[PDB]
Design a protein around this ligand. Sequence first.
Ligand SMILES: O=c1ccn([C@@H]2O[C@@H](CN3CCCC3)[C@H](O)[C@H]2O)c(=O)[nH]1
Length: 124
Amino acid sequence: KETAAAKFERQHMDSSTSAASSSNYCNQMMKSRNLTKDRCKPVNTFVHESLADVQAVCSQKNVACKNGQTNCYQSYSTMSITDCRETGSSKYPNCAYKTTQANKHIIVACEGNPYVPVHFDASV
Ligand SMILES: O=c1ccn([C@@H]2O[C@@H](CN3CCCC3)[C@H](O)[C@H]2O)c(=O)[nH]1
């Protein structure tokens, strides 16, 4: 069964590319990562850094999570990311997305032993 850590990796990790640089990227990735089966997941971010680097964020700058929990962490360095946002004309099962590449500080929620990312909260 899929752990929270594994779910984070499936939903939010894409180390394979340095920067998502096809306009097709989100359309393909949201589908292949199984984020378009139940519904079109409205908003989702992929991080293009090593797993070790993203995991390291759990020991970085402690910040409040959007939900008010205290277990969020902001990366000290900017990271290569791709935001996927569902278009206004996207209709399930044909989920359509805008692909936006950025370099930003990520904010993740961490839990467990080992202490690892389980939620992507925001980028700033
Ligand atoms: O910059 C972002 C912002 C949000 N998300 C996604 O939406 C978050 C929760 N949202 C769903 C509706 C309530 C808040 C999910 O935890 C995360 O998967 C993201 O991937 N990148």
